[PDB]
Amino acid sequence: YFRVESGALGPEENFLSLDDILMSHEKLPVRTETAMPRLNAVPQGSKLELPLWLAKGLFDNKRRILSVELPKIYQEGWRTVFSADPNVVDLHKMGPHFYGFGSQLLHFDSPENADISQSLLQTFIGRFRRIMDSSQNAYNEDTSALVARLDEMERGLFQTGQKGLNDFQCWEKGQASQITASNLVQN
Amino acid sequence: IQELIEVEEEEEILLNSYTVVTSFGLAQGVSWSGRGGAGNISLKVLGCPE
Amino acid sequence: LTPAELIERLEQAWMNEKFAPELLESKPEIVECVMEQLEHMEENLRRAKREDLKVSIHQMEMERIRYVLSSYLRCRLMKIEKFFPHVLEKEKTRPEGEPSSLSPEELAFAREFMANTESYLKNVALKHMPPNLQKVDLFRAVPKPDLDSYVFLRVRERQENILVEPDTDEQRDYVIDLEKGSQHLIRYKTIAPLVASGAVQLI
Amino acid sequence: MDAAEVEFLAEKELVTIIPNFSLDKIYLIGGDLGPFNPGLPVEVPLWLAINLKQRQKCRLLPPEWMDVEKLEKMRDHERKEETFTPMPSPYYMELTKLLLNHASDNIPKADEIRTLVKDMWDTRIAKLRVSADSFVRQQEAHAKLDNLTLMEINTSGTFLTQALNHMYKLRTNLQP
Amino acid sequence: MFCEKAMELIRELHRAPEGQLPAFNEDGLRQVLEEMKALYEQNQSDVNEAKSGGRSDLIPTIKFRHCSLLRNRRCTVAYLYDRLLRIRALRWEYGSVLPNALRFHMAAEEMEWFNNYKRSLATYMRSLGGDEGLDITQDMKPPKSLYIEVRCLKDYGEFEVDDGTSVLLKKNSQHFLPRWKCEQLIRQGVLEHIL
Amino acid sequence: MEFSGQRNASYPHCLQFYLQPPSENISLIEFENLAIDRVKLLKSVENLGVSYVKGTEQYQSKLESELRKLKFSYRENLEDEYEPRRRDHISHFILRLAYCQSEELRRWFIQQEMDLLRFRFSILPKDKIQDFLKDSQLQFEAISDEEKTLREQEIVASSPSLSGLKLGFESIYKIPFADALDLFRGRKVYLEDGFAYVPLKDIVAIILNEFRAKLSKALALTARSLPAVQSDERLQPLLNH
């Protein structure tokens, strides 16, 4: 089963990826720069919240229809908090695709791009060692306390580490040669 | 001007989508042109002691 | 040439195909020769009596060879099914004298897969769409092989003046040399000609 | 690549057996073997040696590096050095498991040898952990690996390369 | 907001990463096609009104409708392709002929696709070399021995071993057979490899 | 695993001895103010002297504030203190010419330099002593240190000034009585068979003495050789006033 991968960290989403489809559903705050009829009308200057896909669709580089702003968690007040000790913050109570969504805001040419990139990279480097140690060393135990705070991207790395551990333990204890049934074990 | 033209192009497309003083070396008579620099041209500066 | 070396070449191709993030170039000669070896040995065991010891030894040898051949071919087929518009278009574009990434049977299979998939989507949903939306481009929808993947490798011949680019600022570019029998961890995009030329092995 | 496939490669290493019967020279695709005579040694690949041992048809002889005196010196040197030291066989772990499970009756001081090989695995894995962490903290771009074996690479390697892919993508993103 | 009926399709598949195949949702698919038809009609009416009246301030609302149509198309196409991936897996797990309990979930066009795929794949394998090629859908694990001992989990019919010779797969009977004949029955769940 | 990927050589330590000429360029205002601020420092050392006793903590605490305020080299820092070190070096070469105008002025600035050097040598941590004694020509090799405890008994019995703890914390090494010249001729301390059981401060006295000798030779050269450089001398009166 060749699941189509997410594109989010690069310059574009992958068209057929389910994760990018869910992630782009998130809402973003904006200001209306030209009045809109039959939506009755929306006057100029009105403040709104609408999905990321629609915001990218309407944002011509002239900034003729609307102008965009960063959500609170990507502004300086919160970046300062991540900088203290990134291990403690809950990136699942933040948006479930923190890095993926954050990487796509750089599209809108804000003056704060140089700060957002440094925030994301430093957060990742800060969190890495705990993911490594805890995934590689937790054998046949309740992992629910460990995996609780991890972002969707980080969770994939946890699963890969666990899989690698399990295979070696099977081989050492001699279980590796036996033939068995696959996902059709459901039935 | 140009920006309005491009705006009108986008609008039209979106709407329609739903519808010789000296000579040397016997230079004369020969045609005078280059290969526009497209040949095996090379330029190098020389000097002594540098 | 000699059979021992032919088997060694097959087992080399197997591991290169596992770790390379693209569909590597085709090897029709190896597949034909290994297949006729299995046919020949089968008839030789068929003609002798089946009770003897050495017959069982020969059968074990054949199982070990057949497994590698099967595994190698399955992997190439995964990569064909996953990236079908790209491999088809690249073969359509290929200049004369350069080797193809597809054997003729693989190309036949790829063409059938392309036609079948397009037909399914058109019949199930796209004919019902508004007239301005009935066309879609699979060449744009289907992703591309990710050549920036990291890989482990071991070198079989010495190489010199290989450029490494951290980040993508020229001020950080530098060069290294690959000594005989050493092992390294590096991005696939920088080493791709060396794998095709046979200078290195992926492990 | 799974542990099963790494073992499949390890089974090509040659070992010495003493047969208890007689057979002529036999020609295989991979080479010529024999002749086999009773009570006299011959070289064969490990996949054949294990099979004949199970069916009570031969005796195994330990490889010359499987010796307590040799393995003690190797363990101490490995603990002292700041890097990976070269190893007595490229497939030392796999060979240890296969021979000591089937051929304990022919290999003296087996339970001493298990502990000595376990210590080397424990040291080398720790060095690999430190190297991975250092690779990410310093945002490095290339590294060298001259004495790691294929089982040791394969155990931890998939995680590391998966993490490095994402990291390389985060640091470049400001310049499409 | 305009995306919500399409998201039902996506969110269903996302909830189950095991590769198992849910029942084809028909009414959601129809609702998406109807919705797009309605949006198209409104946009066409406003386009001709703006063009005939010579009025420019309708253009932002026209762009607004346009991008909504494309979002709806992406959600539905993305949903169909994943089901094709889950279907393709059943040929390589399980076997050539599906159980009726599982065919109940597929659409008619999906059965057409599956049969086309089987025909083409069988053609490729038959052409690999020699006479009648190589069935590469077997030897999924590296081989250790010629013979294995197998135990029957279900009452099953007659099983042919060579020419007229056959064995009867009655539950908890036990046999010693060559590995290459048992391999698919073990994968489908009829037999158990003991020891 | 093993990975792959300029002014340090000028002043590996804050200490410097002016062997190498800085073969580079300067601005007019730059060399002017580099020298003049140090003139203020020379006066300030003796102003601190008239304030209170030489070399006490009051001296130490105020003196480092002068250096931080005046941007010249320090107790040695690991960041770019090489810039203050080369400024100190360059400005030292510039200072050779101002107070060579009279021997009394020469001796005056030499005396505040000796006071400053004694302060810096008083500040030194152990690692500084260990690396500078080896990296400099100031080698002064130690011999047979295990005997120091027999001299822990003998010196303590034999000396009013020294004590058993000073054997270790003013770490004792063997060099001749003549390197402790004032101590043998005053007969102040335990020395035996012509050898002295010596702490660093005696070698500091030797450093100051050879520094004075070399600096005096340089001042003679300053008096003699300088006239080709003297195309401008407008600062000299303001400096001698």
**What CATH fold (topology level) applies to the domain E5-126?**
Methane Monooxygenase Hydroxylase; Chain G, domain 1 (1.20.58)
d(CA B35, CA A95): 62
Taking domain D1-66, whether its CATH number is 3.40.5.50 is answered by yes
d(CA F76, CA F72): 11
How far off is chain C from A24, nearest CA to CA, in Å?
17
Q: Are A58 and E63 in contact (CB under 8 A)?
A: yes
Which residue, among D1, D21, D28, D162, would best test binding to C if mutated, counting the most C CBs under 10 Å from its CB? D28
Q: Is E69 on the interface with C (CB under 8 A)?
A: yes
Q: What is the number of other CB atoms lying within 10 angstroms of the CB of residue B1? A: 4
Q: What is the number of other CB atoms lying within 10 angstroms of the CB of residue E193? A: 16
CATH number for the segment(s) F17-240: 1.20.930.80
**How many CA atoms, within 13 angstroms, populate the side-chain half-sphere of residue C122?**
10
How far the first Cα of chain C sits from its last, in Å, is: 25
**Nearest 5°: CA angle at A9, between A6 and A14?**
35
Chain F: residue whose CA lies nearest to D138: F3
Q: Is E142 on the interface with C (CB under 8 A)?
A: yes
Which residues of chain B neighbour E48 with C-beta distances below 8 Å? 18-19
Which residues of chain D neighbour A156 with C-beta distances below 8 Å? 162
Residue F224: enclosing H or E segment and its boundaries? helix F200-225
Query: Max alpha carbon distance in chain C (Å)?
Result: 73
Q: Do F5 and C176 touch (CB under 8 A)?
A: no
Chain A: residue whose CA lies nearest to C139: A15
Ordered DSSP codes for F13-47: SS-----S---S---HHHHHHHHHHHHHHHHHHHH
Taking Cα atoms as reference points, which of E83, A4, E77 lies closest to residue C121? E77
- Structural domain spans, chain A: 1-174
Helix axis angle, A113-137 to A152-172, nearest 10°: 20
Q: Would you state the structure tokens that stand for residue C76, as one six-digit string? A: 């190439």
**What CATH fold (topology level) applies to the domain A1-174?**
Methane Monooxygenase Hydroxylase; Chain G, domain 1 (1.20.58)
The resolution, in Å, is 3.4
User: C4 Cβ partners below 8 Å, 6+ apart?
Assistant: D29, D30, D31
d(CA D153, CA D146): 12
Task: Name the one residue in this structure whose structure tokens are 């690692």.
Answer: F127
Sheet holding E191-193, edge to edge: E174-178, E147-152, E191-193
Residue D44: enclosing H or E segment and its boundaries? strand D42-45
User: Does the bond joining A37 to the residue before it have cis omega, within 30 degrees of 0?
Assistant: no
Q: Which class for D1: exposed (0-12), middle (13-18), buried (19 or more C-beta within 10 A)? A: middle
Residue D13: enclosing H or E segment and its boundaries? none
Method used to determine the 3D structure: cryo-EM
Q: Are D45 and D13 in contact (CB under 8 A)?
A: yes
d(CA E24, CA E30): 12
**What CATH fold (topology level) applies to the domain D67-175?**
Methane Monooxygenase Hydroxylase; Chain G, domain 1 (1.20.58)
**How many CA atoms, within 13 angstroms, populate the side-chain half-sphere of residue C15?**
21
Which residues of chain B neighbour E47 with C-beta distances below 8 Å? 15, 18-19
Secondary structure class of A43 (helix, strand, coil) = coil
